[PDB]
Amino acid sequence: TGELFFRSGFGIGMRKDSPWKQNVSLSILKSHENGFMEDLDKTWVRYQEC
């Protein structure tokens, strides 16, 4: 019940001195734009609806 409130998003947390920030962000964006995210959502979220 309810429409939406305090809408936010998820993410990946790394330490401030970790040099794996841009190399992970670029990979995440590549996966998002290459259709992997929608396939994962369909295979893990989209199922039978009551």
Partner: protein, 43 residues
């Protein structure tokens, strides 16, 4: 270096990801398709 900070409707893409750095987006939008609409107790 003509403009250090740019604010506007800048689409986020992979090519701009490494060339320039941007913060967390505030509004979500992406690729969508707009198409003109075309004109007994069964269930």
């Amino acid at each position: 270096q003509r403009a250090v900070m740019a604010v506007g409707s800048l689409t986020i893409n992979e090519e701009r990801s490494e060339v320039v750095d941007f913060s967390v987006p505030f509004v979500e939008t992406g690729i969508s398709v707009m198409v003109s609409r075309s004109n007994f107790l069964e269930p």
